[PDB]
Symmetry: C5
């Protein structure tokens, strides 16, 4: 489960990067 | 247990973040 | 317990993202 | 000490999301 | 060290949320 927790954290960071890019 | 709920909630968060990206785009 | 608090705060994060989605529409 | 910091950072994330909700 | 990755990613999330707050107003 920890592997998937870390992987989904990766995904969340990438999506937040997309959101910050769109706001800019 | 707790970790399964963490994974499920993180998946829900991913879906919601995708929805926010779609709304912004 | 740390894990229970993490799960509950994850649930709150899900609620907050839902509220953000509602506000964006 | 990792779990303590994870809980604290989750709390910070909740606070920041609340700030964003108020701003919106 | 999965926990160290989790902490680092959480800190990244905090920084991105601070940037979002700055961009909002």
């Amino acid at each position: 489960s920890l592997k998937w927790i870390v992987f989904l954290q990766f995904l969340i960071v990438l999506l937040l990067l997309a959101i910050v890019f769109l706001l800019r």
